[PDB]
Amino acid sequence: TSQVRQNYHQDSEAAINRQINLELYASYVYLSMSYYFDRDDVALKNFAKYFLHQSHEEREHAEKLMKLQNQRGGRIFLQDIAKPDEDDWESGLNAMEAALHLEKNVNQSLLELHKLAHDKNDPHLADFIETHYLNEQVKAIKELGDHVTNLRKMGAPESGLAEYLFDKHTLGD
Amino acid sequence: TSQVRQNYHQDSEAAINRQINLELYASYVYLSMSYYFDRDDVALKNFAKYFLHQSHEEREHAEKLMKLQNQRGGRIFLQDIAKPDEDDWESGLNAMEAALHLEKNVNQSLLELHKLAHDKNDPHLADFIETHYLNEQVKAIKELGDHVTNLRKMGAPESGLAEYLFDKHTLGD
Amino acid sequence: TSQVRQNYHQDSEAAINRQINLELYASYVYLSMSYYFDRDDVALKNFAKYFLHQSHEEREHAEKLMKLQNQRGGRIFLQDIAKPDEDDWESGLNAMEAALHLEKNVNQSLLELHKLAHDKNDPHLADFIETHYLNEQVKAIKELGDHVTNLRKMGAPESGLAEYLFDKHTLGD
Amino acid sequence: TSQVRQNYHQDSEAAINRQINLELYASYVYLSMSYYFDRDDVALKNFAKYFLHQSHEEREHAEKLMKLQNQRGGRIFLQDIAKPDEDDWESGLNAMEAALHLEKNVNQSLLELHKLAHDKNDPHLADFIETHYLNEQVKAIKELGDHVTNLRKMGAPESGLAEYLFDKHTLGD
Amino acid sequence: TSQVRQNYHQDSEAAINRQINLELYASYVYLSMSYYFDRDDVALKNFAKYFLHQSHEEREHAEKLMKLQNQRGGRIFLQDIAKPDEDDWESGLNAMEAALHLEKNVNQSLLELHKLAHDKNDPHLADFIETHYLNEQVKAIKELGDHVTNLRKMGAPESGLAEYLFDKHTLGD
Amino acid sequence: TSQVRQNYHQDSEAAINRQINLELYASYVYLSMSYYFDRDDVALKNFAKYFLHQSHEEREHAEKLMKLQNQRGGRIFLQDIAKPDEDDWESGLNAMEAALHLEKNVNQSLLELHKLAHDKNDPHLADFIETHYLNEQVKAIKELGDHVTNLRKMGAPESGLAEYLFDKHTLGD
Ligand SMILES: O=C(NO)c1ccc(C(=O)NO)cc1
Ligand SMILES: O=C(NO)c1ccc(C(=O)NO)cc1
Ligand code: NA
Ligand code: NA
Ligand code: NA
Ligand code: NA
Ligand code: NA
Ligand code: NA
Ligand code: NA
Ligand code: NA
Ligand code: NA
Ligand code: NA
Ligand SMILES: [Zn+2]
Ligand SMILES: [Zn+2]
Ligand SMILES: [Zn+2]
Ligand SMILES: [Zn+2]
Ligand SMILES: [Zn+2]
Ligand SMILES: [Zn+2]
Ligand SMILES: [Zn+2]
């Protein structure tokens, strides 16, 4: 056992490792999304840029969890990073929906993480989740839904013009 | 076939995808290394910082290959990211040796990539490899060996003082 | 023979002259394209501006090849500059496709030039082509295809609005 | 007929197209001259630079005529660009004389253009020629003759020193 | 064998050592040239300054090759530096011709070095030669020939005035 | 005989040429030393940097002697530059001792040069040696001995840590 470890359960430790894996996977998902829009036959640079930024942020989420793992005297054990469920994301619209879905997945897991933290009465962990992750996830989910809403109203994905103008007017400023 | 595709072989395309996977794996390896030194029972902050920076750079290598894939009208197809061969890296010294080994792996693959590019007479690809990757890899390999050399001379890894002072005097400036 | 000439084949010399002619022709093509969009019954100022800039750059490509010709002690011999294949380019969309086609022509010729350089083992010439021309051409081809892709999706060329908005949102920033 | 067309004769329209061709040819002539002086066995950098600048300006003359063509609702129809009458210009002195001759050619054509404009009472065209072209041509002709005069007096072209010093003292400031 | 060594042939290693020797010799040649023009009975300060600068640059070429030798895990083994073929260079004109000759020697050797690198498929070495040496040599050769050309035309070396004025007007700015 | 020559003996002239050769050799020695420490299996960057700087300075010493040779109307005649006595310098410690030895060699020769100058009552030469060389050599000798002293006390060369820390704390500031 680590010399710094205090009130830090083996159950929490494993769940953190899993969350780490989950954050890294989301990064990989967003990476996949970004360069799809960079394809010459898709060509939506702001969609590409948007998702690439998202991708880097998710890595930042993972890194922040790993330090936390070390802070508590838990131990990081990494697992394989799964390839995304798709290679071709079909459209700006399909990707935003998939991104919405992903974050609800990541968010629920974090909420489950909080429940576990609370059940073990580890308030340091509970506030860490609250402060750095929960509202971010909430915010992320609202933004993606806002994006989803606008794209539908504009006539996406059939109107290629709709996605183009959205790329330009929303993601490029 | 992509409208932009010209003189870009299916063999090159697959090898690029593999190189992409390899660069992402190296990022993950360096990520693993970094936070090991962040463990409370290792506690070498500059080793940690060093490898974290390395990690981000490797991602940058991958991202640069993916755009390139799209530039030529090839198609990115992602594969799983393998977990590193180890969880506990033993020492500053062991990690630098493992990092040396990794880059020789990544570098040889790039050299094999260049051979393939040359055999297919795709000079755009050959110069891309030359310009952005080959000298970087060469440089990376020299630096890690320099690090290896110094650590041995100082009495690493048995002298914990050796690694401490190296962390301080080499990696912290 | 020139006093500066070294390892510079008569075959290379003639091919450079031809490349010079080809770069000047592309300049003329882009010149033709630019002022078509400047017609009162077309009236797409950013298309016009875009192609005019392209035109000047191609001249720059030619000039850079001519100095190179003199650098190696080869001799510049100019040939007539052919008029473009069309006078009326029909649309923003048709022109971008024609521009895509032109650059693939110019790029293949440069790749053939590189093959010739390589067959004669003239690495100065090979790197010159690699460094100043090959990636530029690659980049040019991706950009035009990106432009092509977006215009199709928006409903060009039938939607005159599509071309207008593209002119405004893509070429005017 | 163009919606903007007013008092713009079909005869003027064709003559403008011809003038456009003539300006582009002069650009090509000056281009040829410039890089001759860039040859290693000629090596007069300021002669080279001088003519290259001249070349770009002539293109500017052509471009200004093409917009004008579109302004009046005439239509630009491009023709082949003829190669210059020579490949080897012999000397700084021979080139300046040839340049003097070229501008007198271009200037007379413009004066003939003005006569045509005046005969058709198209004062917009007459002032356009007066304002942007006629005095420039006049100025160009004086300067080349000044250059011619000085070179003769110095002992050009036999004195290679004469041309060298002229290159240095006149064209390099 | 060095720990950093990868795809680096013993043949390349020896040829690099030879190139190192060759670059150091050129430095010594230019050193000899520089101070000849510094003699009171020659007294061409800009010729002197010109060659001295050239000399320092060649050393820089050698130093860059030596680091490269170490980068690849090859080993630097130095050999004697030969005295130049002459002590009295006769004139500004004779020296420029000798310098032209020297660089063609150095350049051919580098081209032979590239051939060897290519035959061993060591693209790192091939691009290193391309990037840092080949165009520089090409450029150097053009400049010396330009200098040669001008000096002949001016009446050098018999006209002492020719060399004086060249020293002043070309090398002193 | 040179027009500027006054009170400048043929014996002095030859000894200056020899001193020139000696200064160039020391430069070459320091060059050899510098890049040894740049080897991956030595890896002492400040030792490398230290000796490289020393090397450039020695060249400066030679150049200053050559101008002086020309100032007096003596004539520079260059001789071959000998390779250093060793290729592998063993250690930071061994090199500093060898450098100490070299400068005592160079310094004695200069002192012998001064004796010759004095015997010929050439006070210009005597003060030139005094002012630009003698104290520099004296200073150089003290510094190297200071370096030698510190390295011994620290436990060099067996303590690889000793040399590392010296590299860091003395040569890197
Ligand atoms: O026929 C004529 N005179 O007998 C005549 C010729 C030319 C002009 C003129 O300058 N028009 O612009 C006016 C009158
Ligand atoms: O044997 C050959 N052709 O018959 C041959 C010679 C040289 C190359 C080459 O350029 N390697 O880099 C490839 C093939
Ligand atoms: Na997220
Ligand atoms: Na809270
Ligand atoms: Na709370
Ligand atoms: Na790497
Ligand atoms: Na290259
Ligand atoms: Na190359
Ligand atoms: Na082009
Ligand atoms: Na003109
Ligand atoms: Na050189
Ligand atoms: Na010294
Ligand atoms: Zn997240
Ligand atoms: Zn990499
Ligand atoms: Zn080859
Ligand atoms: Zn081009
Ligand atoms: Zn004109
Ligand atoms: Zn060189
Ligand atoms: Zn000295």
Token duo for residue F160: 């690889």
The distance from CA D32 to its chain's CA centroid, rounded to whole angstroms, is 13
Q: Which residues contact D150 (CB under 8 A, 6 or more apart)?
A: D166, D170
Asked whether residue E61 is marked as a ligand-binding residue, the answer is yes
Residue list, CB under 5 A from ion ligand 6: B 106
Distance from CA of A40 to the nearest CA of C (A): 5
CB B77 within 8 A of CB B17: yes
Chain E residues whose CB is inside 8 A of the C9 CB are: none
State whether the beta carbon of B75 lies less than 6 angstroms from ligand 2: no
Chain A residues whose CB is inside 8 A of the C165 CB are: 161, 165
Can you list the pairs that B63-69 forms with residues at least 24 positions away whose Cβ atoms lie under 8 Å? B63/A31, B63/A52, B64/B132, B65/B16, B65/B19, B65/B20, B65/B23, B66/A31, B66/A35, B66/A38, B66/B20, B67/A35, B67/A38, B68/B16, B68/B128, B69/A35, B69/B13, B69/B16, B69/B17, B69/B20
Distance from CA of C96 to the nearest CA of E (A): 34
Token duo for residue D27: 């650009």
Out of E131, E139, E148, closest to residue C3 by CB:
E148
Domains of chain D: total: 1
Strand partners, B81: A81
Out of E149, E155, E162, closest to residue D43 by CB:
E149
Cβ distance E70 to B142 less than 8 Å, yes or no, reads: yes
CB C126 within 8 A of CB C118: yes
Say if residue C123 is preceded by a cis peptide, omega within 30 of 0.
no
State whether the beta carbon of B115 lies less than 6 angstroms from ligand 2: no
Range of the domain at C98: 1-173
**How determined?**
X-ray
Buried b (16+ CB within 10 A) or exposed e, F116-153: bbeebebeebbebbeeebbeebeebbeebeebbeebee
What is the atom index within ligand 2 of the atom nearest the CA of E121?
Answer: 12
Q: Does an interface of 3+ CB pairs under 8 Å exist between E and B? A: yes
C130 at interface of B, judged by CB pairs closer than 8 A: yes
DSSP category for residue A83: P
CB F40 within 8 A of CB E73: yes
B70 at interface of A, judged by CB pairs closer than 8 A: yes
CB F82 within 8 A of CB E80: yes
What is the atom index within ligand 2 of the atom nearest the CA of C118?
Answer: 10
Q: Which residues contact A54 (CB under 8 A, 6 or more apart)?
A: A30, A34, A99
Query: Is F151 strand, coil or helix?
Result: helix
CB E75 within 8 A of CB E69: yes
Q: Which residues contact A121 (CB under 8 A, 6 or more apart)?
A: A7
Distance from CA of C29 to the nearest CA of D (A): 10
Give the CA distances from residue E157 to residues A35, B13, E93, E146, in Å, rounded to whole numbers and listed in that order: 65, 61, 6, 16
CB D41 within 8 A of CB C3: yes
Domain containing B30 — which CATH number?
1.20.1260.10
Chain F residues whose CB is inside 8 A of the B150 CB are: 43-44, 164
Out of A35, A70, A82, closest to residue B76 by CB:
A35
Distance CA E30, CA E36 (A): 10
E135 at interface of B, judged by CB pairs closer than 8 A: no
Q: Which residues contact A115 (CB under 8 A, 6 or more apart)?
A: none
C139 at interface of A, judged by CB pairs closer than 8 A: no
All partners of chain F with 3 or more CB pairs under 8 angstroms: B, E
Token duo for residue B21: 């996977």
Query: Is B95 strand, coil or helix?
Result: helix
Count, residues in chain F = 173
F80 at interface of E, judged by CB pairs closer than 8 A: yes
3-class SS string, E35-84: HHHCCCCCCCHHHHHHHHHHHHHHHHHHHHHHHHHHHCCCCCCCCCECCC
Cβ distance E148 to C73 less than 8 Å, yes or no, reads: no
Residue with CA nearest ligand 2 atom 13: B119
The distance from CA B77 to its chain's CA centroid, rounded to whole angstroms, is 20
Chain D interface test: which of E148, E150, E167 (most D C-beta within 10 Å): E150
Closest CA to D101 of D144, D150, D157: D144
D161 at interface of E, judged by CB pairs closer than 8 A: yes
Q: Which residues contact D164 (CB under 8 A, 6 or more apart)?
A: D44, E150, E153, E154, E166, E169
Give the CA distances from residue C150 to residues A80, A96, B144, C50, F32, in Å, rounded to whole numbers and listed in that order: 37, 19, 46, 16, 60
Token duo for residue F128: 């030139």
State whether the beta carbon of B118 lies less than 6 angstroms from ligand 2: yes
Query: Is F17 strand, coil or helix?
Result: helix
